[PDB]
Amino acid sequence: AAETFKLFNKYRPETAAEKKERLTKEAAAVAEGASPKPYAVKYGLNHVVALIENKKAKLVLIANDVDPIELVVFLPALCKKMGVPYAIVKGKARLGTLVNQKTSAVAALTEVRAEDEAALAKLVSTIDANFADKYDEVKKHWGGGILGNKAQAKMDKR
């Protein structure tokens, strides 16, 4: 998680003030007398879902604390079915920091600068080894059967 947010923090979208300043500089240049495509993290639930089913997202971070949890329950399954790497990241307020929003349910990386192409591939492999291949058998098991002390003392022992 600490290595994932080092790559995702280098493609943070411009804030309103920075974008306004950049546009006003161009406007002031024009008023007196050929650029490459930008790169940023993709967010928004519908936008990221549309990206996933078009096979454009290279890595999708899904928050684990969406209050209407049904907004993201289909997302790991859609990512696995469509062959898109995904990771469940702890904290929806932390995904919004790299988005300049208070919260963000999801985040995604579609295109990356050529300097960070190797880092994204290594991160995808790391998540595949640490997250996908590690939890793919226990992911499909019912959870939450934790027993309290006053209950485990009288059931497990007896």
Binding site: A118, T126, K134
Partner: protein, 133 residues
């Protein structure tokens, strides 16, 4: 069953015997830490072995660092089967060259060059090339 020896692979630059020992001594007492290096020049081969005094310490050291993303590398730590000693991993250093020789006298050394030239000239005759002098 298992041994107390863990094999670590995909090590970054600058993570050598001393660094490996210093990091892995926090998981328990160590008995041997060796790193693979090139013989001709002392340079990490990016893998090594190290043995714990406690066999059950190697399992914990393997479960927590088997997929560690460090310096852009995915560390590969795995415990070896029963037995499987570690040996023959010397700590080589960069080999400087020594300029020694010219034991033969200059007369014989100069006379051998002429006969080498003649034999070289005669050699190419049998290879479908005509060359004079």
């Amino acid at each position: 069953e298992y041994s107390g020896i863990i094999y670590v692979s995909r090590l970054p630059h600058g993570f050598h015997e001393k660094e490996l020992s210093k990091y892995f001594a926090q998981f328990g007492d160590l008995k041997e830490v060796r790193l693979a290096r090139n013989k001709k020049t002392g340079n990490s081969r990016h893998y090594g072995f190290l043995e714990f005094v406690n066999k059950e310490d190697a399992m914990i050291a393997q479960e927590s660092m088997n997929n560690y993303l460090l310096m852009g590398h995915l560390l590969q730590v795995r415990v070896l089967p029963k037995g499987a000693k570690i040996e023959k991993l010397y700590k080589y250093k960069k080999r400087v060259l020594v300029e020694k020789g010219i034991t033969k006298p200059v007369k014989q050394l100069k006379d051998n060059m002429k006969q080498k030239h003649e034999e070289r000239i005669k050699k190419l005759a049998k290879s479908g090339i005509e060359f004079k002098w």
